Design a protein around this motif. Sequence first.
Motif, PDB file in Angstrom:
ATOM      1  N   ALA B 144      69.184  49.121  34.996  1.00  7.50           N
ATOM      2  CA  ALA B 144      69.081  49.524  33.656  1.00  7.50           C
ATOM      3  C   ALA B 144      68.358  50.702  33.755  1.00  7.50           C
ATOM      4  O   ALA B 144      67.388  50.982  34.534  1.00  7.50           O
ATOM      5  N   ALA B 145      68.710  51.805  32.717  1.00  7.65           N
ATOM      6  CA  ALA B 145      67.800  52.999  32.789  1.00  7.65           C
ATOM      7  C   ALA B 145      67.036  52.944  31.343  1.00  7.65           C
ATOM      8  O   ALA B 145      67.716  52.716  30.194  1.00  7.65           O
ATOM      9  N   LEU B 146      65.694  53.438  31.450  1.00  8.01           N
ATOM     10  CA  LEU B 146      65.047  53.465  30.162  1.00  8.01           C
ATOM     11  C   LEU B 146      64.114  54.548  30.282  1.00  8.01           C
ATOM     12  O   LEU B 146      63.618  55.089  31.355  1.00  8.01           O
ATOM     13  N   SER B 161      52.479  57.448  32.423  1.00  8.27           N
ATOM     14  CA  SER B 161      52.514  56.445  33.337  1.00  8.27           C
ATOM     15  C   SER B 161      53.117  55.086  32.833  1.00  8.27           C
ATOM     16  O   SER B 161      53.279  55.081  31.608  1.00  8.27           O
ATOM     17  N   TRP B 162      53.759  54.326  33.470  1.00 10.64           N
ATOM     18  CA  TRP B 162      54.175  53.174  33.236  1.00 10.64           C
ATOM     19  C   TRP B 162      53.698  51.839  33.333  1.00 10.64           C
ATOM     20  O   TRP B 162      53.193  51.566  34.983  1.00 10.64           O
ATOM     21  N   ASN B 163      53.597  50.836  32.667  1.00 11.52           N
ATOM     22  CA  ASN B 163      52.891  49.661  32.679  1.00 11.52           C
ATOM     23  C   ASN B 163      51.440  49.885  33.401  1.00 11.52           C
ATOM     24  O   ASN B 163      50.906  49.046  34.295  1.00 11.52           O
ATOM     25  N   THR B 201      58.110  43.360  29.688  1.00  8.43           N
ATOM     26  CA  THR B 201      57.840  44.193  28.857  1.00  8.43           C
ATOM     27  C   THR B 201      57.441  45.690  29.637  1.00  8.43           C
ATOM     28  O   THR B 201      56.913  45.708  30.530  1.00  8.43           O
ATOM     29  N   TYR B 202      58.027  46.666  29.185  1.00  9.61           N
ATOM     30  CA  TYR B 202      57.764  48.048  29.798  1.00  9.61           C
ATOM     31  C   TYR B 202      57.073  48.939  28.792  1.00  9.61           C
ATOM     32  O   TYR B 202      57.711  49.171  27.734  1.00  9.61           O
TER      33      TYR B 202
END
Lengths: 285, 222, 214
Positions: B144-146, B161-163, B201-202
Amino acid sequence: NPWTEYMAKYDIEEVHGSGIRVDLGEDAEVAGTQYRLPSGKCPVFGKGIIIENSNTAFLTPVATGLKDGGFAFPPTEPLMSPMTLDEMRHFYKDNKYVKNLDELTLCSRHAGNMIPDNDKNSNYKYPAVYDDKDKKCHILYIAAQENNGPRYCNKDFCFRPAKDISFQNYAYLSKNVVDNWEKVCPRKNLQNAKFGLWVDGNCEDIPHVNEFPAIDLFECNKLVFELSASDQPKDRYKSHGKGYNWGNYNTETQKCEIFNVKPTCLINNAAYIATTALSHPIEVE
Amino acid sequence: QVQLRESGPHLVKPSETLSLTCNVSGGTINRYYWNWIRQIPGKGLEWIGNIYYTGTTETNPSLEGRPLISIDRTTQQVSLTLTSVTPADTAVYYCARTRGEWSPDWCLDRWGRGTLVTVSSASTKGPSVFPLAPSSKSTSGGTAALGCLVKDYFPEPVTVSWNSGALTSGVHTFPAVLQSSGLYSLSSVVTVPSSSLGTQTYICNVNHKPSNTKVDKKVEPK
Amino acid sequence: EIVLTQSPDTLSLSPGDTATLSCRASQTITNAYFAWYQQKPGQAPRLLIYSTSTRASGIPDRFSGSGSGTEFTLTISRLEPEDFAVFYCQQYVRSPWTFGQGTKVELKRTVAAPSVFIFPPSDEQLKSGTASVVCLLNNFYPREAKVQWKVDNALQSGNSQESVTEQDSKDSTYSLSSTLTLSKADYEKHKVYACEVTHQGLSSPVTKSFNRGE
């Protein structure tokens, strides 16, 4: 040799006769304690002292009341240092010869008249630095030029003598600065000229030189000053003017040819500038 | 180990004065020459000027005497004072240190991270982060792409940045675009296992220095 | 000032190949005052060689500089992925110090087709009166690519922008993001929003599309 009269001022071991980078060629006693003393007879154009462990100029007056002060004379009433050229000549207006004397000689003599620490009959005479932008004469209370060694100056005063564009208008003066230095001391770099040795009626290249890269005339003078005669490491240490006091700067190849033998003739090469450790790092004729 | 770091504004008005500072730490400023280097997007690297700890400075005549360089030995910080700034002065500014004192060692072996400076009459505006939600049109089988879209901010730069740095693999933060409205828009995406959408959770963390805004956005399937 | 000109501007070399970079000067340059630099995206330049041949600290012997007068070249013996970056030459003989425009050395790899994804506008943005559609091309090589927007099969022009990432540090691929922006009024007047992608890694163009909320 026809160059004898012309090249006399470049016999630095004779006209100057003391260290250039560090000048401590004489000894004197003040209140029964013997101290070392600058004794060079020629002005050292462009020389100054860099304090590397403090944000203080070495011409700042010494502290009175440590790291916030410099190497210059303590404030006095009447004030003796710093004194401008115009102030000096009116201060010695009565004397006849002060009219004749030039800026540097007057500054040197003014410093020599300062009684060292109330010792009326001491040989000691404070050295002086003259600024030609402000026309100020600065009497140096601290005659020391270098204290920089790993013993306690790797991690902190710690200071070194050097040529810098900041020191461009400075002239380091000892008590022995002669009044005719304009004729017997080197000041200007020689354009389109190269030092050489006169052998068998001909002016030949300096037989053996050390070639260093140098991006301009100023750096070559700075290199020559660094390798010049000094009276301190880093009577046994007194150089008496012996050292690598001369350099031939090749502008085209950006090479600084430094040698330790007094030159005795000039060679005409448009790509070369002849410089000495005492010479001003920028001025040319 | 000597560390050089630049600090200054991200936005300066035209005809104003641009003041930048280089905090030299971990090593002495003595016996070294300190430079200001600028690379304009569209040109290469450009040299601005020098300074030695004695106070001696040399500048680039192309700048027309606008740059003024000074050094504070007590704080070991090197400053750049550029006057009469112009949009053409918009660029990334570095402070670099020479290998040594003597001319052959005047190569730049120590560099700062560089700081972006924009010159424009436009005003600073904070970003608007929008979620690029996963969907059947963004899920290729088991992957999946988000992402999240950072839109309508000014000036540059923006960092994503992510998470909180926990998610780094598969992340792609694209260069911004200057929209016709004069604002910048940026997109950041990440590919994640398709099965984790309903249980993981992203959050994308968008940081915008010029406006001092930090925004965390939870991207949820939809 | 002394002008430095580098060539070639771009290079695509596989790891293990040899890269030869050249730098020409407008006037003679002493060997002691020539240097080469490496710059990676998002990072400051790193010194490689100074004095035209002296390798900087920690630089592998794959890098070797040479030259005299107005001719200077930089050689990288056996390229490996960590070497690929932009390279600059510099002179510090006469102020102002100058650099070359740079040479970009891409890592040549095998062709990879992009993975295409499409994201509808968020309900949050729609509440602000704007609708942005984002099309994502993921992990493709070479960089050359083409994205065409079609709203109800109508090719769109002048209302989209795109940008491309640098070469990925793992697979040396590229990724492209294209954003189509419309006012929510214009967005709600149409139904089908499609992203069409053409790349030599694709036998035929791929189109990912969606219906508005359907």
